[PDB]
Coordinates of C-alpha atoms and ligand atoms in Angstrom, one line a residue:
Chain N
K35 CA 0.2 -26.9 -20.5
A36 CA 1.3 -24.8 -18.0
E37 CA 4.7 -23.6 -17.9
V38 CA 6.2 -24.2 -14.7
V39 CA 9.2 -22.6 -13.4
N40 CA 11.9 -24.1 -11.1
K41 CA 13.3 -21.2 -9.1
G42 CA 15.5 -23.7 -7.5
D43 CA 14.1 -23.9 -4.1
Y44 CA 10.9 -24.2 -5.3
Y45 CA 8.2 -24.8 -8.4
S46 CA 6.2 -22.1 -9.7
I47 CA 3.7 -20.8 -12.1
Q48 CA 2.3 -17.3 -13.5
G49 CA -1.8 -17.1 -12.2
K50 CA -3.9 -14.3 -13.9
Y51 CA -2.7 -12.1 -11.2
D52 CA -0.3 -13.3 -9.1
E53 CA 3.1 -16.2 -9.0
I54 CA 1.5 -19.4 -7.6
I55 CA 3.8 -21.8 -5.9
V56 CA 3.4 -25.4 -7.0
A57 CA 4.2 -28.1 -5.0
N58 CA 3.2 -31.5 -5.1
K59 CA 3.8 -35.1 -5.9
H60 CA 5.4 -34.1 -9.0
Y61 CA 7.2 -30.9 -7.9
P62 CA 8.8 -30.8 -4.3
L63 CA 10.0 -27.5 -2.2
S64 CA 13.8 -28.1 -1.6
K65 CA 15.1 -29.2 2.1
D66 CA 16.3 -26.1 2.4
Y67 CA 13.2 -23.8 1.5
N68 CA 11.5 -22.3 4.2
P69 CA 10.0 -19.6 3.8
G70 CA 7.9 -19.7 6.8
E71 CA 4.0 -18.8 7.3
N72 CA 3.1 -15.9 4.7
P73 CA 1.4 -13.4 7.2
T74 CA -0.9 -12.2 4.5
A75 CA -2.3 -15.5 3.9
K76 CA -2.4 -15.7 8.3
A77 CA -3.9 -12.7 8.3
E78 CA -6.1 -13.7 5.8
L79 CA -6.9 -16.6 7.9
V80 CA -7.7 -15.0 11.1
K81 CA -10.4 -13.5 9.6
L82 CA -11.5 -16.4 7.9
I83 CA -11.6 -18.3 11.3
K84 CA -13.9 -15.8 12.8
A85 CA -16.0 -16.0 10.5
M86 CA -16.5 -19.7 10.8
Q87 CA -16.7 -18.8 14.4
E88 CA -19.3 -16.1 14.0
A89 CA -21.6 -18.4 11.9
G90 CA -21.9 -21.0 14.8
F91 CA -18.7 -23.6 13.8
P92 CA -16.8 -24.9 16.9
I93 CA -13.8 -24.1 15.0
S94 CA -10.5 -23.4 16.6
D95 CA -8.0 -20.3 16.8
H96 CA -5.3 -23.1 16.7
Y97 CA -4.3 -24.9 12.9
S98 CA -1.6 -26.2 11.3
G99 CA 0.2 -23.7 8.9
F100 CA 3.7 -23.6 8.3
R101 CA 5.5 -27.2 8.4
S102 CA 9.3 -27.0 7.9
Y103 CA 11.6 -29.8 6.0
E104 CA 12.4 -31.1 9.5
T105 CA 8.8 -30.9 11.0
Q106 CA 7.4 -32.9 7.7
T107 CA 10.1 -35.5 8.4
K108 CA 9.3 -36.2 12.4
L109 CA 5.0 -36.4 11.3
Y110 CA 6.0 -38.4 8.0
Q111 CA 8.4 -40.9 10.4
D112 CA 6.0 -40.6 13.0
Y113 CA 2.7 -42.4 10.8
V114 CA 5.7 -44.7 9.2
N115 CA 6.6 -46.1 12.6
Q116 CA 2.7 -46.3 14.3
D117 CA 0.5 -47.2 11.3
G118 CA 3.4 -48.5 8.9
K119 CA 4.9 -47.0 4.9
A120 CA 1.8 -48.2 2.9
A121 CA -0.5 -46.0 5.3
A122 CA 1.6 -42.7 5.9
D123 CA 2.2 -42.9 2.2
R124 CA -1.8 -42.8 2.0
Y125 CA -2.7 -39.9 4.0
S126 CA 0.5 -37.7 4.9
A127 CA 3.6 -36.5 2.5
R128 CA 7.0 -37.6 2.1
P129 CA 9.5 -34.1 3.5
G130 CA 9.5 -31.9 0.8
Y131 CA 6.1 -33.0 -1.0
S132 CA 3.6 -31.4 1.6
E133 CA 2.1 -28.1 0.3
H134 CA 2.4 -27.3 4.9
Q135 CA 6.2 -26.5 3.6
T136 CA 5.3 -23.1 1.5
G137 CA 3.5 -21.4 4.3
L138 CA 0.8 -21.0 2.3
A139 CA -1.3 -24.2 3.2
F140 CA -3.2 -24.3 6.4
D141 CA -5.2 -27.0 8.3
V142 CA -8.3 -25.9 10.3
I143 CA -9.1 -27.8 13.3
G144 CA -12.0 -28.0 15.5
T145 CA -12.0 -27.1 19.5
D146 CA -12.5 -30.5 20.4
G147 CA -9.2 -31.2 18.6
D148 CA -10.0 -32.7 15.9
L149 CA -9.0 -31.5 12.3
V150 CA -12.5 -29.9 10.3
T151 CA -14.8 -33.1 8.7
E152 CA -18.4 -32.3 9.7
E153 CA -20.7 -31.3 6.4
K154 CA -21.6 -28.3 7.2
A155 CA -18.2 -27.0 8.3
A156 CA -16.9 -28.5 5.0
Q157 CA -19.6 -27.0 2.7
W158 CA -19.1 -23.5 4.5
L159 CA -15.2 -23.8 3.6
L160 CA -16.4 -24.8 0.1
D161 CA -18.5 -21.6 -0.3
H162 CA -17.0 -19.0 1.8
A163 CA -12.9 -19.7 1.6
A164 CA -12.5 -18.0 -2.2
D165 CA -13.5 -15.3 0.1
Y166 CA -10.4 -14.8 2.5
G167 CA -8.5 -15.9 -1.0
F168 CA -8.4 -19.5 0.1
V169 CA -8.9 -22.9 -2.0
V170 CA -10.0 -26.1 -0.4
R171 CA -6.8 -27.7 -2.1
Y172 CA -7.9 -31.5 -2.2
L173 CA -10.9 -32.6 -2.8
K174 CA -12.0 -36.3 -2.5
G175 CA -12.9 -37.1 -6.2
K176 CA -9.8 -34.8 -7.6
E177 CA -7.3 -37.7 -5.8
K178 CA -6.3 -38.7 -9.1
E179 CA -5.7 -35.2 -9.9
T180 CA -4.0 -33.5 -7.0
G181 CA -2.2 -36.8 -6.3
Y182 CA -3.2 -36.3 -2.4
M183 CA -6.1 -37.9 -0.3
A184 CA -9.4 -35.4 0.4
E185 CA -8.3 -33.3 3.3
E186 CA -11.7 -31.2 4.3
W187 CA -9.7 -29.1 6.8
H188 CA -6.7 -27.5 4.3
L189 CA -6.7 -24.3 2.8
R190 CA -4.2 -22.9 0.5
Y191 CA -4.4 -18.9 0.1
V192 CA -3.9 -18.5 -3.6
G193 CA -4.9 -14.8 -3.3
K194 CA -7.0 -12.8 -5.7
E195 CA -7.7 -15.8 -8.1
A196 CA -9.0 -17.9 -5.9
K197 CA -13.1 -16.8 -6.5
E198 CA -12.4 -17.4 -10.4
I199 CA -10.6 -21.3 -9.2
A200 CA -13.3 -21.6 -6.9
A201 CA -16.1 -21.3 -9.6
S202 CA -14.6 -23.8 -11.7
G203 CA -14.7 -26.4 -9.6
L204 CA -11.3 -27.7 -10.9
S205 CA -8.0 -28.7 -8.6
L206 CA -5.0 -26.2 -9.1
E207 CA -3.8 -28.8 -11.6
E208 CA -6.3 -28.5 -13.6
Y209 CA -7.2 -25.1 -13.1
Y210 CA -3.3 -24.1 -14.9
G211 CA -2.6 -27.4 -16.2
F212 CA 0.1 -28.9 -14.5
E213 CA 1.1 -32.6 -13.5
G214 CA -0.1 -33.9 -10.0
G215 CA -1.2 -37.4 -9.2
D216 CA 1.4 -39.6 -7.8
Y217 CA 4.8 -40.0 -7.0
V218 CA 5.4 -41.8 -10.1
Chain I
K35 CA 12.1 -0.1 -20.5
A36 CA 11.2 -1.8 -17.8
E37 CA 7.3 -3.1 -18.0
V38 CA 6.0 -1.6 -14.3
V39 CA 2.9 -3.5 -13.6
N40 CA 0.0 -1.9 -11.9
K41 CA -0.9 -4.8 -9.6
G42 CA -3.7 -2.8 -7.9
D43 CA -2.0 -2.6 -4.3
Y44 CA 1.7 -1.9 -5.7
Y45 CA 3.4 -2.3 -9.1
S46 CA 6.2 -4.3 -9.9
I47 CA 8.4 -5.3 -12.5
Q48 CA 9.7 -8.7 -13.1
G49 CA 13.5 -9.4 -12.4
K50 CA 15.5 -11.8 -13.8
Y51 CA 14.8 -14.4 -11.2
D52 CA 11.7 -13.2 -9.8
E53 CA 8.9 -10.4 -9.8
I54 CA 10.4 -7.4 -7.8
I55 CA 7.6 -5.2 -6.1
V56 CA 8.8 -1.5 -7.1
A57 CA 7.5 1.3 -4.6
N58 CA 9.0 5.0 -4.6
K59 CA 7.9 8.4 -5.2
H60 CA 6.4 7.8 -8.5
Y61 CA 4.9 4.1 -7.8
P62 CA 2.8 4.6 -4.6
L63 CA 1.7 1.4 -2.2
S64 CA -1.7 1.5 -1.7
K65 CA -3.4 2.6 1.3
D66 CA -4.7 -0.9 1.7
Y67 CA -1.6 -2.6 0.9
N68 CA -0.7 -4.5 4.2
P69 CA 1.7 -7.5 3.4
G70 CA 3.3 -7.9 6.7
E71 CA 7.1 -8.4 7.1
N72 CA 8.3 -11.4 4.3
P73 CA 10.0 -14.1 6.1
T74 CA 12.0 -15.2 3.8
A75 CA 13.7 -12.0 3.8
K76 CA 13.5 -12.1 7.8
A77 CA 15.6 -15.3 7.9
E78 CA 17.9 -13.8 5.5
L79 CA 18.1 -11.1 7.9
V80 CA 19.0 -12.8 10.7
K81 CA 22.1 -14.7 9.0
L82 CA 23.4 -11.0 7.9
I83 CA 22.9 -9.3 11.2
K84 CA 24.7 -12.2 12.9
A85 CA 27.6 -12.1 10.0
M86 CA 27.7 -8.4 10.8
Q87 CA 28.2 -9.0 14.8
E88 CA 31.1 -11.8 13.8
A89 CA 32.6 -9.5 11.8
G90 CA 33.1 -6.8 14.8
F91 CA 30.5 -4.6 14.5
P92 CA 28.0 -3.6 17.6
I93 CA 24.6 -4.7 15.4
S94 CA 21.3 -5.2 17.3
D95 CA 19.0 -8.0 16.9
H96 CA 16.7 -5.2 16.7
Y97 CA 15.4 -3.7 13.4
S98 CA 12.7 -1.4 11.6
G99 CA 11.2 -3.5 8.8
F100 CA 7.7 -3.3 8.2
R101 CA 5.8 0.0 8.6
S102 CA 2.3 -0.2 7.9
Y103 CA 0.3 2.8 5.7
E104 CA -0.9 3.8 9.2
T105 CA 2.7 3.5 11.1
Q106 CA 4.1 5.8 8.3
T107 CA 1.0 8.9 8.5
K108 CA 2.2 8.6 12.4
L109 CA 5.7 8.6 11.8
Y110 CA 5.0 11.5 8.9
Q111 CA 3.3 13.5 11.4
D112 CA 5.3 13.7 13.6
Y113 CA 8.1 14.9 11.7
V114 CA 6.0 17.6 10.5
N115 CA 4.9 18.3 14.1
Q116 CA 8.0 18.2 15.2
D117 CA 10.7 19.2 12.9
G118 CA 8.1 21.0 10.3
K119 CA 6.8 19.8 6.6
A120 CA 9.8 20.8 4.8
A121 CA 12.3 18.7 7.5
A122 CA 9.8 15.9 6.9
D123 CA 10.1 16.2 3.1
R124 CA 13.3 15.4 3.6
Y125 CA 14.2 12.6 6.0
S126 CA 10.8 10.9 6.3
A127 CA 8.1 9.7 3.0
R128 CA 4.6 10.3 3.2
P129 CA 2.7 7.2 3.8
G130 CA 2.0 4.8 0.9
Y131 CA 5.6 6.4 -0.6
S132 CA 7.5 4.5 1.6
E133 CA 9.4 1.2 0.2
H134 CA 8.9 0.0 4.1
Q135 CA 5.3 -0.6 3.6
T136 CA 6.5 -3.9 1.0
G137 CA 7.9 -5.6 4.2
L138 CA 11.2 -5.9 1.8
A139 CA 12.9 -3.1 3.7
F140 CA 14.7 -2.7 7.1
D141 CA 16.5 -0.1 8.8
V142 CA 19.5 -2.0 10.8
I143 CA 20.4 -0.7 13.9
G144 CA 23.3 -0.4 16.4
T145 CA 23.4 -2.0 19.7
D146 CA 22.5 1.8 21.0
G147 CA 20.1 1.9 19.0
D148 CA 20.8 4.4 16.3
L149 CA 20.5 3.3 13.0
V150 CA 23.5 2.2 11.7
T151 CA 25.6 5.1 10.0
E152 CA 29.8 3.7 11.0
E153 CA 31.9 4.3 8.0
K154 CA 32.9 0.2 8.0
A155 CA 29.9 -0.8 8.7
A156 CA 28.2 0.7 6.3
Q157 CA 31.2 -0.6 4.0
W158 CA 30.4 -4.3 5.2
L159 CA 26.3 -3.8 4.0
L160 CA 27.8 -2.7 0.3
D161 CA 30.3 -5.6 0.3
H162 CA 28.2 -8.0 1.6
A163 CA 24.7 -7.7 1.5
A164 CA 24.1 -9.0 -1.1
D165 CA 25.4 -12.6 -0.7
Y166 CA 22.0 -12.7 1.5
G167 CA 19.5 -11.5 -1.1
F168 CA 20.1 -7.6 0.3
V169 CA 20.6 -4.3 -1.6
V170 CA 21.3 -1.1 -0.2
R171 CA 18.7 0.7 -1.7
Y172 CA 19.4 4.1 -1.1
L173 CA 23.0 4.7 -1.7
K174 CA 24.9 8.3 -1.7
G175 CA 25.0 10.2 -4.5
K176 CA 22.2 8.7 -6.0
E177 CA 19.3 10.8 -4.5
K178 CA 18.5 12.4 -7.3
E179 CA 18.1 9.0 -8.8
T180 CA 16.1 7.0 -6.3
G181 CA 14.1 10.2 -4.5
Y182 CA 15.2 9.8 -1.5
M183 CA 18.2 11.5 1.3
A184 CA 20.7 8.2 1.2
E185 CA 20.2 5.4 4.3
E186 CA 23.5 3.4 4.9
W187 CA 21.1 1.0 7.3
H188 CA 18.4 0.4 4.9
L189 CA 18.5 -2.6 3.0
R190 CA 15.8 -3.8 0.0
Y191 CA 15.2 -7.5 -0.3
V192 CA 15.9 -7.8 -3.8
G193 CA 16.6 -12.1 -3.4
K194 CA 19.1 -14.0 -5.9
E195 CA 19.7 -11.1 -8.5
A196 CA 20.6 -9.2 -5.7
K197 CA 24.5 -10.1 -6.7
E198 CA 24.1 -8.4 -9.9
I199 CA 22.8 -5.3 -9.0
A200 CA 25.4 -4.6 -6.2
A201 CA 28.2 -5.2 -9.6
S202 CA 26.5 -3.1 -11.2
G203 CA 26.6 -0.1 -8.4
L204 CA 23.0 1.0 -9.9
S205 CA 20.0 2.4 -7.8
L206 CA 17.2 0.0 -8.7
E207 CA 15.8 2.8 -10.8
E208 CA 18.4 2.6 -13.2
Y209 CA 19.4 -0.8 -13.3
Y210 CA 15.7 -1.8 -14.1
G211 CA 15.1 1.4 -15.8
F212 CA 11.7 2.9 -14.7
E213 CA 11.1 6.4 -12.7
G214 CA 12.5 7.9 -9.5
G215 CA 13.3 11.4 -8.2
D216 CA 11.1 13.4 -6.1
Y217 CA 7.5 13.6 -5.9
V218 CA 5.7 14.9 -9.5
Chain U
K35 CA -0.8 43.7 7.7
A36 CA -1.8 42.6 3.8
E37 CA -3.1 45.8 1.6
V38 CA -5.8 43.8 -0.2
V39 CA -6.6 45.9 -3.3
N40 CA -10.2 46.4 -5.0
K41 CA -9.4 45.9 -8.4
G42 CA -13.0 46.4 -9.8
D43 CA -14.7 42.9 -10.1
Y44 CA -12.6 41.2 -7.6
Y45 CA -10.3 42.3 -4.1
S46 CA -6.9 40.5 -5.0
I47 CA -3.4 41.3 -2.9
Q48 CA 0.4 40.8 -3.8
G49 CA 2.0 37.3 -3.4
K50 CA 5.5 36.3 -2.9
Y51 CA 5.2 35.4 -6.7
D52 CA 1.7 35.9 -8.3
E53 CA -1.3 38.1 -7.7
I54 CA -3.4 36.1 -5.5
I55 CA -7.0 37.1 -5.7
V56 CA -9.2 37.3 -2.0
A57 CA -13.0 36.0 -2.4
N58 CA -14.8 35.7 1.0
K59 CA -17.4 36.7 3.0
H60 CA -15.7 40.1 3.7
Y61 CA -14.3 40.2 0.2
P62 CA -16.9 39.2 -2.5
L63 CA -16.6 39.2 -5.7
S64 CA -19.5 41.3 -8.0
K65 CA -21.5 40.1 -9.8
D66 CA -20.0 40.4 -12.9
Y67 CA -16.9 38.7 -12.4
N68 CA -16.7 35.9 -14.7
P69 CA -13.6 34.6 -15.4
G70 CA -14.1 30.5 -15.8
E71 CA -12.1 28.0 -15.0
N72 CA -8.3 29.5 -14.8
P73 CA -6.4 26.7 -17.3
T74 CA -3.2 26.8 -15.5
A75 CA -5.0 25.6 -12.7
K76 CA -7.0 23.2 -14.1
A77 CA -3.7 21.7 -15.9
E78 CA -2.7 21.1 -12.1
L79 CA -5.8 19.8 -11.1
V80 CA -5.6 17.2 -13.5
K81 CA -1.6 15.7 -12.5
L82 CA -3.1 15.8 -9.0
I83 CA -6.6 13.6 -9.6
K84 CA -4.1 11.2 -11.7
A85 CA -1.5 10.9 -8.8
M86 CA -4.7 10.3 -6.2
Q87 CA -5.9 7.7 -8.4
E88 CA -2.2 5.9 -8.4
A89 CA -2.0 6.4 -4.8
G90 CA -5.0 4.0 -4.7
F91 CA -8.0 6.7 -3.4
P92 CA -11.1 6.0 -6.5
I93 CA -11.1 10.1 -7.2
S94 CA -13.6 10.9 -10.0
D95 CA -12.0 12.6 -12.8
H96 CA -15.1 14.5 -11.8
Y97 CA -15.2 18.0 -10.0
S98 CA -17.1 21.2 -8.8
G99 CA -14.2 24.0 -10.3
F100 CA -15.8 26.9 -12.0
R101 CA -19.2 27.9 -10.9
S102 CA -20.7 31.6 -11.9
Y103 CA -22.5 34.0 -9.8
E104 CA -25.6 32.5 -11.8
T105 CA -24.6 29.0 -10.9
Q106 CA -24.3 29.8 -7.7
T107 CA -27.3 31.7 -7.5
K108 CA -28.5 28.4 -8.5
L109 CA -27.0 26.5 -6.3
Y110 CA -27.5 28.7 -3.1
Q111 CA -31.1 28.4 -3.8
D112 CA -31.8 25.3 -4.2
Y113 CA -30.1 24.3 -1.0
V114 CA -32.1 26.9 0.9
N115 CA -35.2 25.4 -0.5
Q116 CA -34.2 21.3 0.2
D117 CA -33.1 22.0 3.9
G118 CA -34.4 25.8 4.9
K119 CA -32.3 29.3 4.7
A120 CA -30.6 28.4 7.7
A121 CA -28.9 25.1 6.9
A122 CA -27.9 26.8 3.6
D123 CA -25.8 30.1 5.1
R124 CA -24.1 27.4 7.2
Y125 CA -23.0 24.7 4.4
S126 CA -23.5 26.5 1.1
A127 CA -22.2 30.2 0.1
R128 CA -24.9 33.1 -1.1
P129 CA -23.7 34.1 -4.9
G130 CA -20.4 35.9 -5.3
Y131 CA -19.6 34.8 -1.8
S132 CA -17.8 31.8 -3.3
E133 CA -14.4 30.8 -3.9
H134 CA -15.8 28.8 -6.8
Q135 CA -16.4 32.2 -8.8
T136 CA -12.7 33.0 -9.1
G137 CA -11.8 30.0 -11.4
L138 CA -8.9 28.4 -9.2
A139 CA -11.2 26.9 -6.4
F140 CA -12.0 23.0 -7.0
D141 CA -14.0 20.4 -5.2
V142 CA -12.8 16.8 -5.3
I143 CA -15.2 14.4 -6.1
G144 CA -14.9 10.2 -5.6
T145 CA -16.4 8.1 -8.1
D146 CA -19.5 7.2 -5.7
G147 CA -20.7 10.8 -6.3
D148 CA -20.2 12.4 -3.1
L149 CA -17.5 14.9 -2.1
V150 CA -14.4 13.8 -0.6
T151 CA -14.1 13.2 3.0
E152 CA -12.6 9.9 3.7
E153 CA -9.7 10.5 6.2
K154 CA -6.7 8.9 4.1
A155 CA -7.5 10.4 1.3
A156 CA -8.6 13.8 2.8
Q157 CA -5.2 13.7 4.1
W158 CA -3.3 13.1 1.2
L159 CA -5.0 16.0 0.0
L160 CA -3.2 18.0 3.1
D161 CA 0.1 16.3 2.3
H162 CA 0.2 16.3 -1.4
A163 CA -1.8 19.1 -2.2
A164 CA 1.3 22.0 -2.0
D165 CA 3.2 20.0 -4.9
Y166 CA 0.4 21.0 -7.8
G167 CA 0.0 24.0 -6.4
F168 CA -2.8 24.1 -3.9
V169 CA -4.1 24.6 -1.0
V170 CA -6.7 22.7 1.1
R171 CA -8.6 26.0 1.6
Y172 CA -11.3 25.4 4.9
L173 CA -9.8 23.3 7.7
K174 CA -11.8 22.5 10.5
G175 CA -10.4 24.7 13.5
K176 CA -9.8 27.7 10.9
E177 CA -13.9 28.3 10.3
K178 CA -13.1 31.5 12.4
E179 CA -10.5 32.9 10.8
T180 CA -11.8 31.5 7.0
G181 CA -15.8 32.0 7.9
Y182 CA -16.4 28.8 6.6
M183 CA -17.4 25.3 7.0
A184 CA -14.6 23.2 6.7
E185 CA -14.3 21.4 3.4
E186 CA -11.7 18.3 3.2
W187 CA -12.2 18.2 -0.3
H188 CA -11.5 21.7 -1.6
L189 CA -8.3 23.1 -3.1
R190 CA -7.9 26.7 -3.9
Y191 CA -4.9 27.1 -6.7
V192 CA -2.2 29.9 -5.3
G193 CA 0.8 28.8 -7.2
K194 CA 4.4 28.8 -6.1
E195 CA 3.4 30.0 -2.7
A196 CA 1.3 27.0 -1.8
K197 CA 4.7 24.8 -0.2
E198 CA 5.1 27.9 2.1
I199 CA 1.5 28.0 3.1
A200 CA 0.9 24.4 4.0
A201 CA 4.3 24.6 5.9
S202 CA 3.2 27.3 7.8
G203 CA -0.6 25.6 9.0
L204 CA -2.3 28.9 7.8
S205 CA -5.4 29.7 6.3
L206 CA -4.9 31.7 3.3
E207 CA -6.6 35.1 6.0
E208 CA -3.9 34.3 8.9
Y209 CA -0.9 33.5 6.5
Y210 CA -1.2 36.9 4.1
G211 CA -2.9 39.1 7.2
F212 CA -6.7 40.1 5.9
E213 CA -9.6 39.6 6.9
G214 CA -12.2 37.0 6.8
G215 CA -15.1 35.6 9.0
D216 CA -18.7 34.7 8.8
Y217 CA -21.1 37.4 6.8
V218 CA -21.3 40.0 9.8
Ligands
ZN1 ZN1 -2.8 -30.2 5.0
ZN2 ZN1 14.6 2.8 5.5
ZN3 ZN1 -16.0 24.6 -2.7

């Protein structure tokens, strides 16, 4: 439905206001694509975290943002080594198939050191994230569409179109009309 | 001929491979546009500087890249205060009208702290910069097209289309067909 | 320095390129002087307003340009009644003593409906107005010379000599060498 363009190092689509990089299990990033952390998204994340803190949530200034292909290989193999391949494929991502390689995705973490999962904090993200240009990328119940286990804590920066996407309740795959799902 | 789109904070055109932000004296950046320094351009710049050093040129590991609207206001007013308005309008750019606010423009500096101007080094940039996704933006003899005094040291990251642009020998204004020149 | 000539219903001096009407608290306009809005100045003002909007400032197409002696009488009296005479004398102008009766002066207004005062917008006028033949007439710091409270939003069309005047940093009074100051 959407026209997905292969730019070699990554795939993307034309959003209403911006080019939107598409990285998922159907649309990988090349092993060489190493854009680093996007500074517009980072600045917006810093404001979001500060807002969550002001609202009384115990959120850390530290986060997991950009993860290079090499960092992702290590993370994935560590999961394979500790919990086995089946589990790694369930909650991690093989390298090149994590949105964190875009430099536009960020996992929010509590001051306790755990990824954010508490109900009211998770809901604050759903209600507020679009004010900062972010969507909560992986919702429970959209797992078949996105291809990924739900992450209450994972934000993807999309910029101006975030409010429209949030209002729709749709995954990016449904909203723009591109395929996600499992590796096959 | 170029469909220049006003995207709100900035103008841009559709290149052959990528969207190209267009910033000059006819297409300013908003006072609120603050993207920071593009990390892809940074990564390419590291490689370029390393290659120039290997070719024997005394190039610094430090450069002048992103300048916010606020930084540009200060830089511009220092020129005005020190050399007068006429000279400031020659050497500098009014805030919102410098490509440095795009985060895609980099002034290369020698190891002595002066902007690079030496003939062989300037020619190296002209001959090699497109291999790293850059063009020498403000060419000798093109001041009437671009609107800016020539800068032997100033690279604009355009990505893959840099090789085609370099081969043409044209300013971006002429190559893509959009307005440049002085203010007004 | 300047030879100020009484032309009947107004005073003027010879500028480097054109006759420059002089209207201030030392040199008022006659009650009968009703030129209407100068259409060359208006044509330049429309281009300047368009340029500011393209630069991202929320400037209205609506402005306060020509104000006849009768209009100024009403404006002045309304301020006297609302704020009292002392206040009216500080921020308004008695009829015959406003440069707006020349048809060459224009107050720029934001789409919010307030006169322009925001810092970056006021600085844009200072940096760019002369390109359209205008000077910012009433600067902070120049009240003693001009005789008027600063107006960040008030442009006086002087034509070609605007660039030399802006570069000097002077009020018209200081630049041309004529008297200004308060009513007495
Ligand atoms: Zn994640
Ligand atoms: Zn430069
Ligand atoms: Zn006024």
